[PDB]
């Protein structure tokens, strides 16, 4: 998995993964902080987890074989490693 990886930097305000669309790349967080966000059935977005250190998201979609449980938007400049 390491020999096939790429890094990327996202400025605040961006969205890395939307809950609606299926995952195609899962991102391992190595620096920065970012927030997990399930589209709330109330008509809003609420807040779940603040994934800052040595954490990944999108894998649970690759295991459950369903759509992304949470939309994930950035918080600050984050050094993310990405695998398809």
């Amino acid at each position: 998995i390491v020999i096939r990886l790429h890094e990327e930097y996202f400025l605040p305000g961006e969205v890395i993964t939307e809950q609606g669309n299926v995952v195609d790349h899962l991102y391992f967080v190595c620096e920065g902080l970012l927030e997990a966000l399930v589209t709330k059935t109330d008509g809003s977005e609420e807040s779940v987890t603040l994934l800052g250190p040595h954490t990944s998201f999108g894998d649970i979609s690759i295991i459950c074989n369903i759509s992304q449980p949470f939309t994930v938007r950035v918080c600050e400049l984050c050094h993310l490693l990405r695998l398809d």
């Binding site: 996202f10 961006e14 609606g20 299926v22």
Partner: protein
């Protein structure tokens, strides 16, 4: 230089090649139109749009191409989530 220079260079070389052999004005027209299209800003759009993460490209696509793909009859699955996919 600039793209307006690459166009003119390629066209000058063609013109040399074509008039050297006395080809013909109709194929001259086809040739000129062809080079005109591949030497404009429109023929590199998919080329530069290769490094934008994907997230922003997603919004550019959903802002530009959405009505075109939505107006096709084949796609009557009615799931606009499937359509945005």
């Amino acid at each position: 230089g600039s793209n307006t220079e690459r166009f003119r260079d390629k066209m000058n070389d063609l013109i040399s090649f074509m008039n050297r052999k006395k080809l013909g004005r109709d194929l001259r027209s086809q040739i000129t139109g062809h080079v005109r299209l591949q030497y404009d800003s429109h023929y590199t759009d998919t080329v530069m749009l290769q490094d934008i993460p994907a997230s922003i490209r997603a919004k550019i696509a959903q802002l530009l191409y959405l009505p075109y793909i939505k107006k096709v009859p084949l796609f009557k699955g009615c799931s606009t989530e499937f359509i945005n996919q």
